[PDB]
Amino acid sequence: SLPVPGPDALAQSEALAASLRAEIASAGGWIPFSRYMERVLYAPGMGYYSGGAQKFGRRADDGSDFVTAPELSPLFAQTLARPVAQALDASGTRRVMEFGAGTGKLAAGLLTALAALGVELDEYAIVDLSGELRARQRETLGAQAPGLAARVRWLDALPERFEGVVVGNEVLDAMPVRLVAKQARGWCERGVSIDDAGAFVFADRPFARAEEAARLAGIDADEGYVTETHDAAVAFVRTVCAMLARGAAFFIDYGFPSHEYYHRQRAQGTLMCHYRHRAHGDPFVYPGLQDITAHVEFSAIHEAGVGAGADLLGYTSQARFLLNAGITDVLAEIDPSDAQHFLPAANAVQKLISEAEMGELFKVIAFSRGIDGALDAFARGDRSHTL
Ligand SMILES: Nc1ncnc2c1ncn2[C@@H]1O[C@H](CSCC[C@H](N)C(=O)O)[C@@H](O)[C@H]1O
């Protein structure tokens, strides 16, 4: 069912795989799933995300693996600019920092939409783990925001403090997770080993310490339940919120609060892989050539940000956030008689806000420091009390 990679791509994946087999052997034959993801997704040079921009796009026939809101439509960035601007104003700051900037479309769109709102930034900082997307980002910015691109900086390291607005779209979902599985007796960790034939397989091990099972005790799990823990995303949000001195941080991503994430019925968890616009469950397929994600558990994200000293600014579905922020007014700026522009825009809005598409599954959580009031983008249907 999955497309076969070309022979040159298979050679890269094979080299990654062979090194990882050797690593698992040297480790004693078992590694946590988080280390497996760390390698296949983020190995320097060889990881899926240590690579260029082809993976981002709209359709299989452009060579991409998955679509994201910035790739889908400029109306996403144009809408997001409204709460970003309000947060800059409320906090008295003048910089934006984006993590995981992809092709640069979100940055170019935010810059041009912020300018149209009368907001000039001192800096738009792009934070990626390595530098392989810098050339495509520069190209996008030159093509789509030519008179504003000069304000962009690609950081090699985070500042100790930051005053401004942080953005990350589909960044939290991409972070390594550990897998846990319910036994007859308590819970264990599901990791990765290598079978007799040299294939990657799941394999279970006990936890080293009892705190580890006790944090899962509240899950109403039957034997066989398997789900994900999200320490990496928690650590990242703490880093962001400890760095933030004044301003806000917005994370847009698919997921749920804890009571929904770890619901009795969600017994297979949320782990999914994306390859050439096919979603499937096998993270051992073509290592380095496909993504592996889990949904975001927003209660733990909330606790992470607030625990590092930030305030919760809001939490709601992407539909409510974008509607509150003015996406319907953004669409109304386009003349309905201009069919070439209007129909694709209306279609993308539908995808961004419909519960059958992105609108309910995707959520937006925000943190702040030095913001006393509420953002308009959270003024209706905020779900903070459910976290
Ligand atoms: N700790 C971290 N800091 C910066 N980027 C990270 C990160 N962890 C993961 N990422 C990056 O986040 C990206 C997720 S893919 C989504 C890309 C883009 N925001 C879009 O919507 O189109 C990847 O490029 C991955 O390398």
Side-chain angles (χ1 to χ4, degrees), residues 1-93 95-119 121-184 186-195 197-208 210 212-263 266-267 269-349 351-387:
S1 203
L2 301 186
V4 179
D8 294 291
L10 286 170
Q12 316 310 302
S13 178
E14 281 162 356
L16 175 62
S19 179
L20 194 45
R21 284 189 283 268
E23 179 177 352
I24 293 169
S26 70
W30 185 93
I31 63 170
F33 191 69
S34 50
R35 191 171 324 150
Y36 177 80
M37 272 179 84
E38 288 165 10
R39 293 287 181 278
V40 303
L41 300 179
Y42 300 112
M46 302 182 82
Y48 182 66
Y49 283 125
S50 307
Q54 180 137 230
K55 58 174 66 56
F56 312 104
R58 297 190 77 200
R59 291 184 77 100
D61 69 15
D62 68 52
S64 52
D65 290 320
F66 54 92
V67 59
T68 56
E71 296 304 310
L72 181 72
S73 176
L75 279 76
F76 182 69
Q78 291 169 340
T79 306
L80 184 57
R82 296 178 177 200
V84 172
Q86 184 171 40
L88 289 166
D89 181 44
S91 62
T93 59
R95 303 183 172 239
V96 170
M97 183 186 292
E98 184 184 359
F99 290 82
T103 63
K105 282 184 176 78
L106 185 62
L110 282 170
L111 280 162
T112 65
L114 284 171
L117 290 167
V119 174
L121 302 170
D122 293 349
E123 185 176 289
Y124 190 112
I126 289 176
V127 182
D128 275 299
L129 294 165
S130 45
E132 301 95 346
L133 300 166
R134 285 185 189 189
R136 173 65 182 280
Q137 294 164 357
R138 286 190 313 262
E139 182 184 78
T140 302
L141 285 162
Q144 301 194 345
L148 305 160
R151 295 285 166 83
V152 180
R153 300 287 183 279
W154 288 264
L155 308 181
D156 297 316
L158 288 188
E160 302 195 275
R161 298 317 288 269
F162 178 67
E163 295 179 352
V165 172
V166 170
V167 169
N169 184 71
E170 290 199 30
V171 170
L172 303 183
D173 71 59
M175 304 204 175
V177 293
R178 298 171 79 150
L179 303 176
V180 294
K182 181 79 173 66
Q183 319 187 104
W187 287 87
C188 64
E189 186 163 9
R190 179 151 299 164
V192 182
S193 295
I194 299 302
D195 73 13
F200 297 106
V201 296
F202 290 117
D204 289 351
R205 288 298 109 99
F207 298 126
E212 293 182 66
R215 59 171 194 172
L216 308 171
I219 305 172
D220 185 30
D222 284 3
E223 194 176 332
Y225 194 108
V226 61
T227 192
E228 303 85 31
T229 61
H230 308 87
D231 292 316
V234 163
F236 172 83
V237 172
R238 295 178 176 162
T239 291
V240 172
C241 289
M243 172 192 68
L244 184 68
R246 188 165 78 258
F250 296 85
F251 304 108
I252 312 98
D253 226 323
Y254 43 92
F256 319 100
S258 75
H259 60 273
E260 184 67 37
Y261 198 100
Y262 296 115
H263 192 277
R266 213 179 297 277
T270 70
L271 197 77
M272 197 64 58
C273 312
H274 313 88
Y275 175 64
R276 296 299 197 278
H277 297 262
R278 281 77 167 178
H280 72 100
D282 188 353
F284 305 131
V285 166
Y286 303 136
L289 302 178
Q290 65 167 20
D291 98 350
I292 300 164
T293 69
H295 282 40
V296 173
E297 197 283 279
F298 285 96
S299 299
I301 296 308
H302 164 228
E303 289 153 30
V306 167
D311 302 316
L312 177 69
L313 184 57
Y315 166 73
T316 197
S317 73
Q318 179 170 284
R320 288 293 203 158
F321 182 89
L322 294 176
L323 282 167
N324 296 342
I327 194 165
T328 65
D329 301 323
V330 170
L331 179 61
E333 290 173 4
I334 307 166
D335 166 7
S337 310
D338 176 5
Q340 157 177 0
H341 288 126
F342 185 77
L343 296 173
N347 189 278
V349 171
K351 284 186 172 60
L352 289 167
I353 72 169
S354 166
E355 58 72 44
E357 296 289 349
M358 298 175 86
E360 173 63 23
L361 174 66
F362 285 69
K363 311 292 194 296
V364 180
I365 193 164
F367 301 93
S368 60
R369 286 181 187 262
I371 291 174
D372 287 346
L375 297 190
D376 297 8
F378 295 110
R380 312 266 283 242
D382 187 81
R383 311 186 181 176
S384 291
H385 96 260
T386 74
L387 289 165

